Amino acid sequence: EEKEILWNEAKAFIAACYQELGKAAEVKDRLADIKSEIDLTGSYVHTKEELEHGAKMAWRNSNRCIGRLFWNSLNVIDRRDVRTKEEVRDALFHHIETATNNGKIRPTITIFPPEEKGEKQVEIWNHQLIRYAGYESDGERIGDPASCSLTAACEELGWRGERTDFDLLPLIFRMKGDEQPVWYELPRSLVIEVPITHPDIEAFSDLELKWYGVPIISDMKLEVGGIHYNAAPFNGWYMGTEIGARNLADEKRYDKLKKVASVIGIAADYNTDLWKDQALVELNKAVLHSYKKQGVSIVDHHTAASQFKRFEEQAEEAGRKLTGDWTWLIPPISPAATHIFHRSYDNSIVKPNYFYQDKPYE
Amino acid sequence: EEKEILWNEAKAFIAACYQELGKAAEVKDRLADIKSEIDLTGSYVHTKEELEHGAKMAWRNSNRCIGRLFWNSLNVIDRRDVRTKEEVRDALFHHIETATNNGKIRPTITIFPPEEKGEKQVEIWNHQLIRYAGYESDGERIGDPASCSLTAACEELGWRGERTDFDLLPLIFRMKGDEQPVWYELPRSLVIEVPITHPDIEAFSDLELKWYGVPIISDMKLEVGGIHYNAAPFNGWYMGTEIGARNLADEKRYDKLKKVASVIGIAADYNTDLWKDQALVELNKAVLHSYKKQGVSIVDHHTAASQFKRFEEQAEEAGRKLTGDWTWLIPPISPAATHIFHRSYDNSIVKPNYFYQDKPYE
Ligand code: HEM
Ligand code: HEM
Ligand SMILES: Nc1ccc2ccc(CNCCCc3cccnc3)cc2n1
Numbered sequence: 001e002e003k004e005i006l007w008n009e010a011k012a013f014i015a016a017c018y019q020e021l022g023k024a025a026e027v028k029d030r031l032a033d034i035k036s037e038i039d040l041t042g043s044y045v046h047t048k049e050e051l052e053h054g055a056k057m058a059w060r061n062s063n064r065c066i067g068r069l070f071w072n073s074l075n076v077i078d079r080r081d082v083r084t085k086e087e088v089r090d091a092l093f094h095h096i097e098t099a100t101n102n103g104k105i106r107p108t109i110t111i112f113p114p115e116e117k118g119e120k121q122v123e124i125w126n127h128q129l130i131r132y133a134g135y136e137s138d139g140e141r142i143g144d145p146a147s148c149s150l151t152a153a154c155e156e157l158g159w160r161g162e163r164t165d166f167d168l169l170p171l172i173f174r175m176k177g178d179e180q181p182v183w184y185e186l187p188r189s190l191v192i193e194v195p196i197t198h199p200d201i202e203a204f205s206d207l208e209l210k211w212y213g214v215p216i217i218s219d220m221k222l223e224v225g226g227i228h229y230n231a232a233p234f235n236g237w238y239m240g241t242e243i244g245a246r247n248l249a250d251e252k253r254y255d256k257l258k259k260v261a262s263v264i265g266i267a268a269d270y271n272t273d274l275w276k277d278q279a280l281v282e283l284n285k286a287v288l289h290s291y292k293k294q295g296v297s298i299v300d301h302h303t304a305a306s307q308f309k310r311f312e313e314q315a316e317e318a319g320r321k322l323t324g325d326w327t328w329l330i331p332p333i334s335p336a337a338t339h340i341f342h343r344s345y346d347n348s349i350v351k352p353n354y355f356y357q358d359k360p361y362e
Numbered sequence: 363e364e365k366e367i368l369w370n371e372a373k374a375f376i377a378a379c380y381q382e383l384g385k386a387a388e389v390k391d392r393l394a395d396i397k398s399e400i401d402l403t404g405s406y407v408h409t410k411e412e413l414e415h416g417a418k419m420a421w422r423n424s425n426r427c428i429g430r431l432f433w434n435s436l437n438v439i440d441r442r443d444v445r446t447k448e449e450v451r452d453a454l455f456h457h458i459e460t461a462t463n464n465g466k467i468r469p470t471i472t473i474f475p476p477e478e479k480g481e482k483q484v485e486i487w488n489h490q491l492i493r494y495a496g497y498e499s500d501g502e503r504i505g506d507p508a509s510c511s512l513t514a515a516c517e518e519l520g521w522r523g524e525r526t527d528f529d530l531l532p533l534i535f536r537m538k539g540d541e542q543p544v545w546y547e548l549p550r551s552l553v554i555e556v557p558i559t560h561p562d563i564e565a566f567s568d569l570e571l572k573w574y575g576v577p578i579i580s581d582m583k584l585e586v587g588g589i590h591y592n593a594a595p596f597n598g599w600y601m602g603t604e605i606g607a608r609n610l611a612d613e614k615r616y617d618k619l620k621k622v623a624s625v626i627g628i629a630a631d632y633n634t635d636l637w638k639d640q641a642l643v644e645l646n647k648a649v650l651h652s653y654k655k656q657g658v659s660i661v662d663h664h665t666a667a668s669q670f671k672r673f674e675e676q677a678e679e680a681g682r683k684l685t686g687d688w689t690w691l692i693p694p695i696s697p698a699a700t701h702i703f704h705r706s707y708d709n710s711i712v713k714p715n716y717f718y719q720d721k722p723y724e
């Protein structure tokens with residue numbers, strides 16, 4: 001059964017991938033090799049080219065991503081050879097290092113061994129490789145509430161944060177065979193952080209806000225041709241709204257808008273004064289300014305929307321069907337000022353793709 | 363066939379309406395009367411109570427409306443007795459007058475005779491009873507582009523606008539029997555307009571912006587118990603975003619953001635400066651301030667979202683199933699600062715309701 005489902009998904013993928021690669025004649029003698037290897041071993045092993053392209057095809061089919069224009073420039077690191085947790089850790093250290101690239105962020109993905117027969121070889125617990133801790137205990141709310149569950153889990157394993165609002169969580173992953181995950185504190189030298197300042201409001205630094213340079217998502221399942229790479233951390237760069245309008249703005253996150261309104265000198269008393277809307281703008285201007293000022297990659301929601309329109313045009317030009325999630329594609333500030341708002345998208349799921357998976361903690 | 367569809371819809375409605383009215387025992391001797399009247403006449407006639415409540419039930423089931431909290435305070439004017447176009451016109455004049463209420467807007471709906479056997483008795487061409495004209499001719503873009511089609515149609519019938527950016531369109535409707543619609547110029551005394559000013563930027567008046575006080579939608583089909591009131595203009599008050607973020611902001615409408623950015627003293631050169639977002643806020647602050655300053659009803663998107671949450675709570679409290687359109691319920695500015703963004707809604711269509719219908723023009 002599980003041998004059949006793999007064969008069907010692989011037939012669809014290899015045909016399409018080789019179709020796009022210009023190896024349409026190589027499809028047949030490859031499917032045979034797979035047809036045998038599947039029957040004999042239970043699974044098949046991707047070539048370096050299929051996997052590189054499969055990871056690019058998966059980003060392209062991410063209905064919720066606004067930055068899909070550059071799907072083909074994705075730097076794919078093939079780490080299916082890792083066996084030890086010192087290799088996993090070093091590869092994760094290297095990913096941070098090479099994806100960061102001194103501030104000029106390279107969209108990168110590191111691919112670890114996939115599930116054999118549903119069995120994970122490596123199991124990453126981090127949502128993102130770089131992420132702040134969160135603490136909730138008796139009136140105490142410190143750090144990122146979104147990180148509360150993982151933080152408690154890490155503290156169950158011997159780790160202790162300094163309990164600042166910006167404690168770097170450790171890397172925490174579990175190898176096949178071991179009962180508990182291991183954890184490694186992140187070298188500070190490898191992590192770029194950006195202090196949030198404002199172009200013309202010098203009082204803005206009094207908020208002492210900051211965020212990390214590179215968002216490296218590490219808890220999603222890359223699925224390529226019936227093969228489940230449950231451990232494949234990828235990254236791009238930030239769209240400013242993710243930080244300025246959600247991470248630092250949400251009440252169930254950092255909840256900084258009243259503080260922003262105070263330092264930008266406006267009152268937070270009346271809804272009719274639109275202080276939340278005004279604070280959201282100056283904070284988001286601050287995030288973009290701070291990242292540019294340091295030399296770290298970032299895009300604003302308008303430029304990103306322009307780029308995504310090109311992706312729509314590129315897709316149409318290629319005879320490729322477009323898929324997208326409107327509810328996720330629209331930016332959380334001024335969405336009506338983007339073309340995304342004024343058209344619809346087909347939220348159908350095409351593989352290869354990236355999927356959510358259950359947390360090993362909680 | 364058309365006799366059956368009416369009977370099914372009526373059975374569902376009468377049962378439910380009387381259920382809510384506390385006349386659950388009166389359901390049976392009423393359905394009989396309908397069962398006969400349908401068989402003998404092809405249709406049935408609503409009582410003054412069912413229609414009043416049916417129009418309130420229809421507003422409640424509008425998945426896209428954020429102001430549904432006050433569905434029960436809807437003022438229903440029963441004008442199913444109109445036979446002449448001087449009665450239709452006067453009723454429309456009266457609707458404007460009583461709904462406006464010197465600035466303290468009453469949510470009102472005027473109900474005209476419904477379709478007999480698919481045949482319209484009255485056919486209103488106006489999108490809204492009060493709306494500005496739009497002109498596009500050889501580089502000329504004057505007024506509201508959204509009104510271009512209707513405006514041209516009105517000018518085909520002897521009407522001529524002064525070709526300002528804010529020409530009041532005439533009322534234009536067609537009576538059963540007549541080939542062409544008639545038109546009547548609106549008495550200026552009945553129309554409240556609001557000049558857009560800014561609380562602290564005196565240069566804002568240089569834009570010479572204004573909008574009308576009351577949005578009275580007149581091209582939607584009210585459906586109550588298999589009965590199609592194709593002519594039932596209704597109104598509430600404006601949520602500020604409709605004017606400040608869409609009507610006056612969209613490029614395919616009034617397209618005023620660069621002009622707003624100029625008068626509020628910021629540059630419109632870089633996306634990273636978030637000038638569209640900043641202009642959208644000050645313009646929207648201007649709209650709310652201008653309406654309050656004059657004494658015309660208006661609500662901001664935050665207060666409206668708070669009210670809609672109460673509607674959600676009121677519905678849950680009543681054992682009533684909630685339906686809603688997330689893509690339309692979220693406001694076009696700072697939507698993530700509202701609870702609407704962070705939950706989902708069932709976009710199922712429940713009757714009674716309001717529906718789009720084909721334009722007699724274009
Ligand atoms: C190049 C820079 C990129 C930008 C600016 C970008 C932008 C975004 C944004 C803003 C989101 C919404 C996230 C949220 O609201 O929480 C998103 C979602 C997503 N992006 Fe991208 N993205 C980029 C690169 C990538 C890359 C390299 C991949 C993977 C190969 C990817 C795959 C996805 C996926 C899977 C989601 C959905 C995540 C979810 O379900 O929460 N994107 N993208
Ligand atoms: C009390 C004040 C009201 C407010 C503030 C309000 C707010 C809104 C808003 C903002 C929209 C979205 C319109 C758009 O984006 O174009 C909307 C849609 C709608 N509202 Fe309301 N509304 C109110 C009263 C009413 C009333 C009295 C009715 C009818 C009885 C109604 C029925 C609807 C319907 C049918 C739509 C959907 C129209 C469409 O499909 O374009 N609302 N409402
Ligand atoms: N710039 C980018 C690129 C890719 C991204 C991929 C994923 C995400 C976030 N997805 C998970 C959101 C769910 C969540 C998790 C924790 C706290 N709140 C919400 C962002 C990306 N950004």
Ligand SMILES: Nc1ccc2ccc(CNCCCc3cccnc3)cc2n1
Nearest residue numbers: 429489508577579597598599600601604
């Ligand atoms: N405050 C309110 C209350 C009720 C409303 C009902 C309808 C509308 C607008 N619906 C039609 C939008 C489609 C359109 C038409 C012309 C130009 N652009 C878009 C607003 C309401 N507002």
Ligand SMILES: C[C@H](O)[C@H](O)[C@H]1CNc2nc(N)[nH]c(=O)c2N1
Nearest residue numbers: 327328329330331703704705706
């Ligand atoms: C209910 C809704 O799907 C949910 O709140 C979504 C809305 N759209 C979103 N869009 C983005 N980019 N990110 C999000 O977290 C969400 N949340």
Ligand SMILES: C[C@H](O)[C@H](O)[C@H]1CNc2nc(N)[nH]c(=O)c2N1
Nearest residue numbers: 341342343344689690691692693
């Ligand atoms: C494609 C999408 O449905 C369309 O652009 C909608 C989005 N949500 C909206 N929401 C409101 N309130 N008004 C609108 O006109 C629209 N337009």
Ligand SMILES: [Cl-]
Nearest residue numbers: 128215242247
């Ligand atoms: Cl993030």
Ligand SMILES: [Cl-]
Nearest residue numbers: 490577604609
């Ligand atoms: Cl309107």
